[PDB]
Amino acid sequence: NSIQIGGLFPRGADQEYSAFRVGMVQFSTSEFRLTPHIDNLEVANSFAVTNAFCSQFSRGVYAIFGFYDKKSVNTITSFCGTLHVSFITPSFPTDGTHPFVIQMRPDLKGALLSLIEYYQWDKFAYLYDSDRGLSTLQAVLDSAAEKKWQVTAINVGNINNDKKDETYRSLFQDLELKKERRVILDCERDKVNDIVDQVITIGKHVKGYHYIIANLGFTDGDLLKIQFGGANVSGFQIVDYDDSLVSKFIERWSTLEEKEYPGAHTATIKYTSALTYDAVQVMTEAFRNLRKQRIEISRRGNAGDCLANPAVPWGQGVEIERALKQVQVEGLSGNIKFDQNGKRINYTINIMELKTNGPRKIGYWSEVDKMVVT
Amino acid sequence: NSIQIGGLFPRGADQEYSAFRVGMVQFSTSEFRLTPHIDNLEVANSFAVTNAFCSQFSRGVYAIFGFYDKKSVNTITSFCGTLHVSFITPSFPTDGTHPFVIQMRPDLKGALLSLIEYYQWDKFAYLYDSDRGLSTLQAVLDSAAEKKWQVTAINVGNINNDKKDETYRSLFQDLELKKERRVILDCERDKVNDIVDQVITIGKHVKGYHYIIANLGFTDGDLLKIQFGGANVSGFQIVDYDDSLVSKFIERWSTLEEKEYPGAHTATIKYTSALTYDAVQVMTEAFRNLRKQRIEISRRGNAGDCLANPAVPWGQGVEIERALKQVQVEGLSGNIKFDQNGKRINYTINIMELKTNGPRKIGYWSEVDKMVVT
Amino acid sequence: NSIQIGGLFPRGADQEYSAFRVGMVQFSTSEFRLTPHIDNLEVANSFAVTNAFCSQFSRGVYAIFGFYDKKSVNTITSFCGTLHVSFITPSFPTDGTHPFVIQMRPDLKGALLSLIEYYQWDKFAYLYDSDRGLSTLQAVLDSAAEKKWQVTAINVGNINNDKKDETYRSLFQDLELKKERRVILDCERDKVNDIVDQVITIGKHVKGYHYIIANLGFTDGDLLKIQFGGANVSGFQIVDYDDSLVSKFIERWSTLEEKEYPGAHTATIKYTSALTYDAVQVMTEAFRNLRKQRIEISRRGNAGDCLANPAVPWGQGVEIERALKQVQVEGLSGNIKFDQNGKRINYTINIMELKTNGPRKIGYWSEVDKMVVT
Amino acid sequence: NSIQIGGLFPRGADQEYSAFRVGMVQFSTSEFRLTPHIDNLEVANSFAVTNAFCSQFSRGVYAIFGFYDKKSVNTITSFCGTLHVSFITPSFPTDGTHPFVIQMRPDLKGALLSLIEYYQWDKFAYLYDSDRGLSTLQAVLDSAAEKKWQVTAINVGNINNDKKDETYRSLFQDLELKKERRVILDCERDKVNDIVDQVITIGKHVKGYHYIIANLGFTDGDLLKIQFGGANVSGFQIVDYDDSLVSKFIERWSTLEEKEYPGAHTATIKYTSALTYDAVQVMTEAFRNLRKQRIEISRRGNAGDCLANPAVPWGQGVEIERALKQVQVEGLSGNIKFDQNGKRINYTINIMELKTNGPRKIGYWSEVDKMVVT
Ligand SMILES: *[C@@H]1O[C@H](CO)[C@@H](O[C@@H]2O[C@H](CO)[C@@H](O[C@@H]3O[C@H](CO)[C@@H](O)[C@H](O)[C@@H]3O)[C@H](O)[C@H]2NC(C)=O)[C@H](O)[C@H]1NC(C)=O
Ligand SMILES: *[C@@H]1O[C@H](CO)[C@@H](O[C@@H]2O[C@H](CO)[C@@H](O[C@@H]3O[C@H](CO)[C@@H](O)[C@H](O)[C@@H]3O)[C@H](O)[C@H]2NC(C)=O)[C@H](O)[C@H]1NC(C)=O
Ligand SMILES: *[C@@H]1O[C@H](CO)[C@@H](O[C@@H]2O[C@H](CO)[C@@H](O)[C@H](O)[C@H]2NC(C)=O)[C@H](O)[C@H]1NC(C)=O
Ligand SMILES: *[C@@H]1O[C@H](CO)[C@@H](O[C@@H]2O[C@H](CO)[C@@H](O)[C@H](O)[C@H]2NC(C)=O)[C@H](O)[C@H]1NC(C)=O
Ligand SMILES: *[C@@H]1O[C@H](CO)[C@@H](O)[C@H](O)[C@H]1NC(C)=O
């Protein structure tokens, strides 16, 4: 027995594929082993995304895995919902409910707002980038209207990095003269590293400057540059480096080689790779459950073409989606459990603030409870 | 000759299709004829959009006309950029550069910011609809950050129609608590009509209030019910009914036997339908120029399917794009001129206010010259 | 044992006929039956009213039910008082005393004056209509003369359906010039609805104003429009919807169909039709009382001619009149009891105010007690 | 050359009948005679009015002359407008356009308001009655609202004569409490006589108190009872006794005995009787016009009854109306010219003021020209 699955990875995602492969070899069951097809492409390109999706659908896959960007989330969700093909992804949650999509990255708007309230902020600057959607920006603006916050939102995606050296100085001087020492960096890791590099270059990390990084990879990026800068630096993390599961996984990970497993000869892993490991775990758990329920979702023939009119759905896909959204498993990113929509629930987000000795967990955040200080 | 094009009209777009037929029957001549294949679909469904798009592509069409939405713009842009097939649309301009896309709606961020500066505002509210995009919201937020404004951004897109009566009342009660006198409505015609109805019901159209309708169709709405309220109302208009071309078009549009041409037997025309008429005009002009240039654009049924692997485009696409972007003609929207990215330049937006004797054009806005008061 | 009665209804008053039939079937048979002749006409045309009255009298009817207007009240009064034929009517009470006429509508002049005194008005406006007489206008003027008020009486009746908007806008502009915020509407349902639409259009339903609907049909109008404006809206109501009889009737009435009972599928009921129902009850009770007294009212022969000279009145008409004015029952309007002149006594008018949550009763008015607050 | 006309007169009208007979003998042309039938009846009884009208129509009359009051005007107007029978009346004009009715009494609201403005009045009192229509009161109130007047309107037509002492004493005490030295008496002859008697009794007829008699007959009342005292007393006059025609008529009028011509041997004639004489003149000359036009209008006892179903008119009656309403003559009232409605157009109202010596003309009022001074 073997279930065919599809894999989508961007051009430059080596650690994610390495983590997927280690997860496959780890939770591979002798009763049934997944046969994954891996397609490398430009995740921003919707044409390439739909090409790969239709190729996988023609191959007759039961659960598609892969990433999506701001420019392909719509087509991915639309094709999955119309064709009843389950999609598992560690990318940003969709801006609203979307069937047949398994969002494994927990929402961070709640944790970010709780951290702002805990720090008791009234006015700050929101440095955002349109790469993970503007849902966090909308949530911040709505909460600012509710709580009477003086938030100044500045976009950094549109400015070309060539000419974006004087505008950084201008807006930083504006913040300094307005005493806007509180900033939030809602950007991808590369953009966050670029922004903090410019911050150190311009010397805008003096005492009083409280930086908040709105991503789950706080330690995954570079923090040794502002370790002793005397600036309040905070962030969030979904993977805990203390529990036994992640400890043993990291041992088995750093004991690997960087030749056949790129991006695996270190101790610090990315939350995307950890969530891909967790996705392998949830996939094998749900397929095992479906097999144990005496349901053979195996399609007799090929699924056909995606474009073929009228749409060609299949109830085995709905069954696979139902099995996917009914799994409760412990993993690297914490407790894994989903709603009927596909979003992730029952999760804990560890909050840490950078100090001179290093980042240290100042507490944890969940959904059933507000921010907790540890 | 006979050149075949495509159509992606939405399901519920009748006036735009009527304007399309009117433009076809007017600009049609003995030189050549335009044979379109019109598909009525859900512009929000990317799967349906893809089906229609490469259905027309397999039909071997030369250019495509239609609409899109924030949930399907990326699919259209990627498909056109990859298959080199042009796409003329009256929908919102794409947030950035996209080749083989001709956008007929002029940008409104610059005109709106100029109008706000002319009115000398410092604390106002911005009611935006997430179902259409947030480019204008991003622009106004950046300007406020660079000009020290107090913008209260409130989303009115998630408001369902089952209880969209108390929601607006509570929203405006909160605005009154915040002492908000000036409001900017960045919504479509139906949404702004609902907001105006709620404003009138809760009696918030009295003297001392200001409203700015952030859309090109100022006179498209039922603006008569708020005309006698006594509150400042400002907006933008793209079609000048006092122009000879617009008057001559209306002279035939008002007597079009509405049963045959839906939404025609009236003196007002929505800016989307006006841009559809202008799109027919510009397509005819571009094809006439291309043929009169001694260029062979013969194409047979060799297009294949949109998901061909590898996807080889046709060489006539770039020449059609160049011919389409080199058109300088006059229409209902005014002067029509495109840049190297497909966006419109050398255009004029008429800023209007609402008075007790009807709307009046106080001035005009341009991209080379800022707001001008007459 | 069939008792012959008559019926006059206007061309457009169908809910009143529906309520008449509902009462006719509610008290169908106790010890006899009632046989009505229904005649529809223009109630404001005295010739048609006389023709119908003469035809019904020639048909040998015992009592007559029907409406009248300011230009047809005198004819009905004179014919009834000379031919000794009773006339039960829900129309406006006659400006004086008149025999053989039963006026079901309670007087509103006392309640209106008491409400004005309770609100402590000194300067206000009085929008009257030349539709139901100017008796209330004369009473208000006399009271103002005796209490040192400043009444601005304006007629809103002599306007056509071609410049109503302009006329009302000019009237309220003059009202603003005089700085009058307190307004009284002596109009009926349609006229007050038009005035409400116009005042909403000009934006004068906001806080700082006060309107009194001087008619018993407070909730019968469309008060949903001004319920959220923030201005006081008072009124009067004769049917008490949270009663026992009223609730039972509304349950039995909202279940009917508009196909067979026009205007009889709603949770509300106009006071005219309610008084029609109570008139049916009153006539049935009066004839049951006459049967209990064992008096033969059967005519010796044909009634004769309506315009007979000399006019000889049948003596049994006086007994019919006494039975009509002697009955005392409880219905929708409340305690129904008449005096020697046919007017209503021992009645109660429920004063209502239009709050945001809805029209809430604030007290009741009687003839032996002044306005009582609860 | 033999025409039947109908006559309606109140039970107690003598001078009007005498003037009717005077006009009949004075215009008894040898070409044709107008044989009248006189019906004496209580004009305030709509049934009696209808009976007489139906009898006259049944015998086939061509025109009807008579009077009415506020309780019998609608019956006459409706019956005339339905059966197409002309009706000449010196009574008060109807408050609108009523066909087939000739109103020889000129309106007085315009002259009254012109006199008020010429006397420079801002606050005064207006004592009226409900026995001659409320059109003058409505006009006074509308003009007061337009010109910022303070008018005290008090109705004195609802009181009896035994309680008149106390009622009028309280009324004049209230007038003194407002210091009302300027009053307008829009009442009938008996009412104004009682008013002036009570004024003399209280002693308020001293200089300073200004009285205006709002009727055309300022010689019929006790013009000498209140003449002494120096009090301003004004009034109107439609008859001019200095005119040659009026003097020649009254020269015979005085010589006529009282036996067969009641109320004739006097130097003063009521304006109602003057309008009766003018009515005889106008019907006679209109029938001369009809006879000279070569038109046969022969009617006899064949018109049937008034209550015929369906009520069919008789055609040449509209020709009677056209002859009546499209003519101009000279009479006691002056120039007699009617419009398409039936009201006078080119009347000249004279204005009289009272001193201790007696009445004296002040000026004249016309429809095209305002108050005139001499
Ligand atoms: C950077 O991190 C340090 C870590 O201690 C922060 O120090 C303390 O931060 C808290 C809250 O962030 C401050 O409490 C505040 O006190 C003021 C009264 O001065 C009160 O009005 C506020 O509502 C809030 O409770 C606390 O004062 C501050 N200092 C100490 C010694 O505890 C610091 O605030 C962080 N930010 C910056 C810009 O330094
Ligand atoms: C609705 O539109 C009217 C247009 O008349 C607005 O009136 C504006 O009121 C402001 C008051 O702040 C005026 O500004 C003043 O300008 C003078 C001269 O520069 C300056 O000395 C004052 O200190 C003040 O700044 C403004 O001139 C005036 N508009 C015009 C055209 O004169 C009204 O405010 C608008 N309503 C709302 C709610 O925005
Ligand atoms: C509308 O209603 C309010 C509240 O009842 C009125 O305000 C009151 O006015 C009276 C004078 O008549 C004062 O004595 C009270 O103090 C006021 N407040 C309250 C809470 O009663 C108001 O006058 C009414 N009319 C208008 C035009 O606003
Ligand atoms: C009554 O008549 C007298 C004289 O005809 C009026 O007396 C003067 O009228 C003028 C008119 O504008 C006033 O300016 C004077 O002040 C009046 N003088 C006096 C002593 O009264 C008088 O106004 C008329 N009306 C009344 C009510 O007396
Ligand atoms: C803009 O359009 C107008 C009208 O066609 C034209 O006269 C003008 O030259 C254009 N401007 C430029 C810069 O081409």
Author numbering:
A (entry chain A), B (entry chain B), C (entry chain D), D (entry chain C): 10 to 383
Paper text:
AMPA glutamate receptors (AMPARs) are ion channel tetramers that mediate the majority of fast excitatory synaptic transmission. They are composed of four subunits (GluA1–GluA4); the GluA2 subunit dominates AMPAR function throughout the forebrain.
We next determined cryo-EM structures of the GluA2–TARPγ2 receptor under two different pH conditions in an apo state (in the absence of l-glutamate). We chose pH 8.0 to ensure strict alkaline conditions for our structural studies and note that the GluA2–TARPγ2 kinetics at pH 8.0 matched that at pH 7.4, used in the functional studies above. As already apparent in the two-dimensional (2D) class averages, the signal encompassing the NTD tier was diffuse at low pH but was well defined throughout the receptor at pH 8.0. This difference was clearly reflected in the three-dimensional (3D) maps; the NTD tier was compact at pH 8.0 with the two dimers associated through the BD interface (comparable to previous structures), while the BD interface was absent at pH 5.5 in most classes, resulting in highly heterogeneous NTD dimer conformations (for example). At pH 8.0, the BD chains were spaced apart by ~55 Å (center of mass (COM) distance) throughout the classes, while the BD distances ranged widely at pH 5.5; some NTD dimers adopted an upright conformation with a ruptured BD interface (class 31), while either one or both dimers bent toward the LBD tier in other classes (classes 19, 23 and 37), resulting in a range of COM distances between the BD chains (70–93 Å). The two-fold symmetric BD NTD interface is stapled together by cation–π interactions between R172 and F231 on either end that are unique to GluA2 and is stabilized in its center by van der Waals contacts and H-bonds, including those between the H208 side chain and the I203 main chain. Despite its relatively small size (400 Å solvent-accessible surface area), this GluA2-specific NTD interface largely maintains a compact conformation of the receptor in structural snapshots of the gating cycle. Taken together, our data imply a unique regulation of the predominant, GluA2-containing AMPARs. These are endowed with a pH-dependent conformational switch—a compact NTD (at neutral pH) and a ruptured NTD (at acidic pH)—that responds to presynaptic activity and thereby tunes postsynaptic transmission and plasticity.
